[PDB]
RNA sequence: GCUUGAGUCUCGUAGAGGGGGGUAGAAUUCCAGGUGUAGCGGUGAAAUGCGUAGAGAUCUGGAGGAAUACCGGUGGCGAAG
């Protein structure tokens, strides 16, 4: 057990899925959550509720660690980035700053070709 | 015979013009290790598929291949490609 001022989060937030984890500053995972393990299942796993309940859930789960003044970070182009820390926010961590990152390749290699619908 | 076409010499200017050799950063994948955990992925909707042998997430190190975000253009160079 360990109580922990400035905790980092992690959003990960996919097209069909946001996961969210939260561990120390040095990346060892205190708790984490998912839209899939809410409940929901397949097209409603992508709605920004599903993400809100998420992160209320995984905040419930890590409540027991004395996170306060947290850190967080948003990855990925989903929905619902937005949601995810008004929820934080909601849940009671004191939210002291926010990053945004998200990959960029610099014209690394191919990706997948277009999809014909 | 002549200098107006054509060509040679002197001084400068711009350019993804070509051939050879080095090197750098970002990203995908694989491998090893740390945290910890029951989902991940995909779709109109699903299923096939991956996960307790420890996945997906997150942090550290390594391997290898390929291509050069922004500048970037309404831009430039080449006989054309
Ligand atoms: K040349
Ligand atoms: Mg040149
Ligand atoms: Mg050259
Ligand atoms: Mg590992
Ligand atoms: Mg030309």
């Given at each position: 057990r360990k109580?922990?001022?400035?905790?980092?989060?992690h959003i990960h937030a996919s097209f069909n899925?946001?996961?969210?984890?939260?561990?120390?500053?040095?990346g060892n995972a205190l708790g984490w959550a998912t839209a899939?393990?809410?409940?929901?299942?397949?097209?409603?796993?992508?709605?920004?509720?599903?993400?809100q309940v998420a992160a209320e859930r995984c905040a419930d789960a890590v409540k027991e660690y004395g996170i306060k003044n947290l850190e967080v970070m948003?990855?990925?182009?989903?929905?619902?980035?937005?949601?995810?820390?008004?929820?934080?926010?909601?849940?009671?961590?004191?939210?002291?700053?926010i990053t945004?990152?998200?990959p960029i390749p610099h014209n690394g290699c191919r990706p997948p070709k277009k999809?014909?619908?």
């Open positions: 109580q922990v001022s400035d905790g980092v989060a899925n946001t996961i969210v984890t939260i561990t120390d500053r040095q899939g393990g809410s409940g929901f299942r397949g097209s409603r796993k992508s709605t920004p509720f599903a993400a948003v990855k990925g182009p989903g929905p619902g980035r937005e949601s995810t820390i008004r929820a934080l926010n909601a849940a009671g961590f004191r939210i002291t700053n945004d990152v998200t999809r014909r619908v």
